Design a protein around this ligand. Structure first.
Ligand SMILES: CC(C)=CCC/C(C)=C/COP(=O)(O)OP(=O)(O)O
Ligand SMILES: [Mg+2]
Ligand SMILES: [Mg+2]
Ligand SMILES: [Mg+2]
Ligand SMILES: [Mg+2]
Ligand SMILES: [Mg+2]
Lengths: 335, 317
């Protein structure tokens, strides 16, 4: 929606002023404004806007004042602040060149390993936003605790992902569906799906831990498909982002399923060519994925997962609106 | 710190590891949980825990003697370990910039907020304590960045080396988390929330923090192995050297400060000797001590002066 997107984007400049406008150190506050302006407001803002929409479908229609919708928007920007911090750090860790076409922050002149500090700074900053706007509301402490908990869980996700690599070479014996599912849950699903919905619920004064647990069950399932679809399109999606999962030696759903279905000779091709810099090595792995019928396998998974998740949504108890979870399903599966 | 204080503090650490690495919960990710136990065990509990133990001492000297139960002194010890978790994340980040992964510093920092939630979420001091940690984290990061703005393309920017910028770096990068945080935590646990009491403490603790770092800066070059010169750090010695330098002495700093060759380090030290930085530190040490002793004696708003004298005596020796 034009009105929702514009109202949301209009909040960002206020959050920069809140965090940067410490009058004795103007040179660092000016630099932090640039850190925020480069890394936080560019691209889709899907997680941020999903927080606003989640709130709009959870709150009683009589309580949906512009004031409250703005508070939802500020929570959305706190999600985008958390993500910005995570992606600054991940880019340094993965030594990536670009993110969404933009050169990675750490590559910019006179940053490098100072990106570590900028990561921590950006993550810490969202708690200052929460204090200014929410310190007087009952949802304050639950929201602070949710952000700190999700940060901790995301770090477990990132560390689990790193235990699939040694000396910058993939450990293919680690590429199991159980480890993949755990990586997606902790590294992606909590901050991408649980965080926006739980923020919406808290702002709507929904504190029942069972309601949050029932939301989690369905959101972790949708989250798994989301990342599996993302992994699939990296290799088989119409380029005209250019996919580099194979070169980077990522524990992707494609690599996991490839190893499940491979005969010994096919396993040897993964051992020899997976996570190598040569473009020839990327094409050999892609050719193996085609040979193992991974496009057909994804097509079956997409149809089956959709049906299973839709069934689980129909069985949701409590005051949780099924509407919200069907709406999330629609945007992800695009149907 | 007394034997009993030290031993009962150290005894808390294994509990905090079990609390954070999910002992009792039966986790779906044991491999990475076991790794985090090792990150904590290897990086957090080793050497002197002076910030952690200072939090316990601060609480013991602010709380009414009747309220000093083993249970409350243990809580003070847990706040102390949260300061040591912050210290550990900051040290990891310094090790990285010069087994451990890059996100371990973010993880360790995040873990202190899990410890705070577990032990303090139902106490009145909860919101003030988490807000103090949030604010100190932010300020420490600002200090870290201000320090980095004294360096461009691997070279020190000597025009940035002013006493104004140095004082700001020490205040934001070190003094807030090293001196303000332990005392304010003690005060909050003792249900002392009055902003004027906190501001009275801050004034003295920012002054102690400045001597602490200036003494550290001095001993790096003139102690009995320091690499501040080689690393081109914005140290008190370099700041004062540039204040006192004639144009020829400035050119020696321009040419030889922040160079890897050990000969450049000895040239800078020779220049520091020539500029009378030892004598200058001796004057600063005497004058700062007399000013800080004065302010501690003048401390009001119902604060005990003996807490701050103990901190002062530990730093100045
Ligand atoms: C604790 C931290 C730092 C978490 C990082 C979370 C994250 C979404 C990383 C990107 O994943 P990726 O590296 O597998 O993919 P890409 O970089 O291509 O988006
Ligand atoms: Mg990564
Ligand atoms: Mg990456
Ligand atoms: Mg990428
Ligand atoms: Mg991807
Ligand atoms: Mg030093």
């Amino acid at each position: 929606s034009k009105e929702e997107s514009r109202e949301f984007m209009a909040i960002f400049p206020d959050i920069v002023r809140d965090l940067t406008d410490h009058t004795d150190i103007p040179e660092v506050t000016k630099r932090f404004a640039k850190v925020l302006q480069y890394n936080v407001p560019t691209g889709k803002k899907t997680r941020g806007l999903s927080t606003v929409i989640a709130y709009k479908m959870l709150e009683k229609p009589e309580n949906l004042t512009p004031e409250n919708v703005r508070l939802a928007g500020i929570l959305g920007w706190c999600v985008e602040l958390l993500q910005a911090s995570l992606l600054i750090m991940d880019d340094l860790m993965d030594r990536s060149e670009t993110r969404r076409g933009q050169p990675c922050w750490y590559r910019q002149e006179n940053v490098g390993f100072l990106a570590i500090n900028d990561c921590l700074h950006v993550e810490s900053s969202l708690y200052s936003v929460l204090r200014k706007y929410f310190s007087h509301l009952p949802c304050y402490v639950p929201i602070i605790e949710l952000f700190h908990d999700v940060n901790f869980k995301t770090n477990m996700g990132q560390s689990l992902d790193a235990l699939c690599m040694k000396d910058g070479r993939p450990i293919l014996s680690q590429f199991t569906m159980k480890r993949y599912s755990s990586i997606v849950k902790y590294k992606t699903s909590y901050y991408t799906f649980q965080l926006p919905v739980s923020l919406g619920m808290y702002l709507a004064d929904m504190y029942d831990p069972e309601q949050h647990r029932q939301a989690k069950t369905i959101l972790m399932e949708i989250g798994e498909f989301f990342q599996i679809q993302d992994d699939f399109l990296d290799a088989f999606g119409d380029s005209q982002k250019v996919g580099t999962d194979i070169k980077e030696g990522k524990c992707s759903w494609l690599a996991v399923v490839a190893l499940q279905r491979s005969n010994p000779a096919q396993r040897q091709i993964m051992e020899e060519h997976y996570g190598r810099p040569e473009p020839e090595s990327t094409q050999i792995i892609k050719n193996l994925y085609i040979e193992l019928g991974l496009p057909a396998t994804f097509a079956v998974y997409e149809e089956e997962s959709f049906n299973i998740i839709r069934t689980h949504i129909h069985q949701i108890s409590k005051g949780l609106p099924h509407d919200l979870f069907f709406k999330i399903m629609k945007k992800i599966y695009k149907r």
